[PDB]
Design a protein around this motif. Structure first.
Motif, PDB file in Angstrom:
ATOM      1  N   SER A   1      -5.290  -2.412   4.800  1.00  0.00           N
ATOM      2  CA  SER A   1      -4.064  -1.654   5.044  1.00  0.00           C
ATOM      3  C   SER A   1      -2.903  -2.519   5.502  1.00  0.00           C
ATOM      4  CB  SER A   1      -4.290  -0.589   6.109  1.00  0.00           C
ATOM      5  OG  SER A   1      -4.489  -1.187   7.380  1.00  0.00           O
TER       6      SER A   1
ATOM      7  N   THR B   1      -1.432   8.521   1.839  1.00  0.00           N
ATOM      8  CA  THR B   1      -0.699   7.273   2.001  1.00  0.00           C
ATOM      9  C   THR B   1      -0.973   6.683   3.377  1.00  0.00           C
ATOM     10  OG1 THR B   1       1.082   8.115   0.584  1.00  0.00           O
ATOM     11  CG2 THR B   1       1.559   6.165   1.915  1.00  0.00           C
ATOM     12  N   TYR B   2      -1.421   5.435   3.397  1.00  0.00           N
ATOM     13  CA  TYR B   2      -1.586   4.708   4.642  1.00  0.00           C
ATOM     14  C   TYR B   2      -0.249   4.683   5.389  1.00  0.00           C
ATOM     15  CZ  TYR B   2      -6.123   2.149   4.130  1.00  0.00           C
ATOM     16  OH  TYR B   2      -7.428   1.723   4.046  1.00  0.00           O
ATOM     17  N   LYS B   3      -0.270   5.068   6.662  1.00  0.00           N
ATOM     18  CA  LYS B   3       0.909   5.016   7.524  1.00  0.00           C
ATOM     19  C   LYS B   3       0.493   4.431   8.868  1.00  0.00           C
ATOM     20  CE  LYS B   3       3.891   6.925   4.656  1.00  0.00           C
ATOM     21  NZ  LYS B   3       4.990   6.122   4.031  1.00  0.00           N
ATOM     22  N   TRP B   4      -0.069   3.230   8.816  1.00  0.00           N
ATOM     23  CA  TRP B   4      -0.647   2.618  10.003  1.00  0.00           C
ATOM     24  C   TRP B   4       0.387   2.076  10.984  1.00  0.00           C
ATOM     25  CZ3 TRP B   4      -5.221   2.311  12.500  1.00  0.00           C
ATOM     26  CH2 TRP B   4      -6.335   2.862  11.855  1.00  0.00           C
ATOM     27  N   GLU B   5       1.570   1.722  10.497  1.00  0.00           N
ATOM     28  CA  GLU B   5       2.629   1.334  11.427  1.00  0.00           C
ATOM     29  C   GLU B   5       3.071   2.553  12.239  1.00  0.00           C
ATOM     30  OE1 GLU B   5       5.622  -1.468  10.148  1.00  0.00           O
ATOM     31  OE2 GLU B   5       7.206  -0.339  11.160  1.00  0.00           O
ATOM     32  N   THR B   6       3.249   3.686  11.565  1.00  0.00           N
ATOM     33  CA  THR B   6       3.588   4.923  12.261  1.00  0.00           C
ATOM     34  C   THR B   6       2.499   5.299  13.269  1.00  0.00           C
ATOM     35  OG1 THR B   6       4.992   5.802  10.498  1.00  0.00           O
ATOM     36  CG2 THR B   6       3.989   7.403  11.989  1.00  0.00           C
TER      37      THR B   6
ATOM     38  N   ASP C   1       3.057   0.731   6.871  1.00  0.00           N
ATOM     39  CA  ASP C   1       3.324   1.996   6.195  1.00  0.00           C
ATOM     40  C   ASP C   1       3.476   1.703   4.704  1.00  0.00           C
ATOM     41  OD1 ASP C   1       3.249   3.295   8.637  1.00  0.00           O
ATOM     42  OD2 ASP C   1       5.279   4.084   8.536  1.00  0.00           O
ATOM     43  N   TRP C   2       2.594   2.287   3.901  1.00  0.00           N
ATOM     44  CA  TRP C   2       2.606   2.068   2.462  1.00  0.00           C
ATOM     45  C   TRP C   2       3.640   2.939   1.758  1.00  0.00           C
ATOM     46  CZ3 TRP C   2      -2.081   0.294  -0.682  1.00  0.00           C
ATOM     47  CH2 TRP C   2      -2.815  -0.660   0.035  1.00  0.00           C
TER      48      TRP C   2
ATOM     49  N   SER D   1       0.924  11.753  10.194  1.00  0.00           N
ATOM     50  CA  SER D   1       1.431  11.054   9.014  1.00  0.00           C
ATOM     51  C   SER D   1       0.366  10.800   7.947  1.00  0.00           C
ATOM     52  CB  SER D   1       2.099   9.736   9.413  1.00  0.00           C
ATOM     53  OG  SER D   1       1.174   8.858  10.031  1.00  0.00           O
ATOM     54  N   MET D   2      -0.880  10.622   8.372  1.00  0.00           N
ATOM     55  CA  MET D   2      -1.965  10.380   7.422  1.00  0.00           C
ATOM     56  C   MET D   2      -2.819  11.622   7.151  1.00  0.00           C
ATOM     57  SD  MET D   2      -3.052   6.404   8.090  1.00  0.00           S
ATOM     58  CE  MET D   2      -2.780   6.185   9.849  1.00  0.00           C
TER      59      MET D   2
ATOM     60  N   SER E   1      -3.692  11.811  13.288  1.00  0.00           N
ATOM     61  CA  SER E   1      -2.511  11.195  12.699  1.00  0.00           C
ATOM     62  C   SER E   1      -1.820  12.217  11.813  1.00  0.00           C
ATOM     63  CB  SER E   1      -2.897   9.990  11.852  1.00  0.00           C
ATOM     64  OG  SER E   1      -1.781   9.517  11.103  1.00  0.00           O
TER      65      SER E   1
END
Length: 269
Positions: A73, A90-95, A77-78, A15-16, A13
């Motif tokens: 989470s 930063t959690y970016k689980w939608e991404t 996206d946090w 983003s993470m 990831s």
């Protein structure tokens, strides 16, 4: 033996800034994304720990994707790291779920980035609906099993914040801001009902301080969601509220099995 063996994958990831573990079973170009609950662990997804989900979907003509991790989470996206508990990113689980993971699975396995199902429970029930609301091409199908259907309303921001703090010390304020922040409504399935209607999302919705008070809040929110979906022109929903249904893995599994034919017909029919 289509899609076997079950695989454990390391998916980067960007983003993470780390690799996300993903449990995977093949068997078709379209997939069921099985999202975990509030207390998601870093070794295995709760569906695999607690249920025979993989075996039940073996030879279904569908792939099964179980992302691993993301405690508290909400698969969102946090705004920022949960500083409270020492989170160093930063959690970016939608991404991850909408871009990074499907790109990886497409490139490496040929899983389609489009035409899939999102299935969530507890924390992730709302997530599944929100993913379909904003990414309808990826998710024409969403199931919410005992999800928070109106997270921005009334008692829910407080109760969600408390639950997140109890599950790993995560801070809802770092996620979507104070309850007045636009992110709460953005990520509220009830508020996004018009998107679910406009997209003709196939939705499958299940549900089963003192417990009685919590049950009252839950009952009322669920009835309101169902009523609002109908009033807003929704015509592609299944609403399952059996009296003997519970908020537990055995009944979440019962629902996963019950919806199999439904998912097959929507995704592959």
């Amino acid at each position: 033996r289509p899609g076997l063996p079950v695989e454990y994958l390391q998916v980067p990831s960007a983003s993470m800034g780390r690799d996300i573990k993903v449990q995977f079973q093949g068997g078709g170009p379209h997939a069921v994304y099985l999202l975990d609950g509030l207390r998601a662990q870093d070794d295995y997804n709760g569906w695999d720990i607690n249920t025979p989900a993989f075996e039940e979907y073996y030879q279904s003509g569908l792939s099964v994707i179980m992302p691993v991790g993301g405690q508290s989470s909400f698969y969102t996206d946090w705004y920022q790291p949960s500083q409270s508990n020492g989170q160093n990113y930063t959690y970016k689980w939608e991404t991850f779920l909408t871009r990074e993971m499907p790109a990886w699975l497409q490139a490496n396995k040929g899983v389609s980035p489009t035409g899939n199902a999102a299935v969530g429970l507890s924390m992730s029930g709302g997530s599944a609906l929100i993913l379909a609301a904003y990414y309808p091409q990826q998710f024409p199908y969403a199931a919410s099993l005992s999800g928070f259907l109106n997270p921005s309303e009334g008692w829910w921001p407080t109760l969600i914040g408390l639950a997140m703090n109890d599950s790993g010390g995560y801070n809802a304020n770092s996620m979507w801001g104070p309850s007045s922040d636009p992110a709460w409504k953005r990520n509220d399935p009830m508020v996004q009902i018009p998107r679910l209607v406009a997209n003709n999302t196939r939705i499958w919705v299940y549900c089963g301080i003192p417990a009685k008070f919590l049950e009252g809040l839950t009952l009322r929110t669920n009835q309101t969601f169902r009523d609002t979906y109908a009033a807003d022109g929704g015509r592609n929903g299944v609403f399952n509220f059996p009296p003997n249904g519970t908020h537990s893995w055995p009944y979440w599994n019962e629902q996963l099995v019950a919806m199999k034919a439904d998912i097959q017909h929507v995704l592959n029919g």
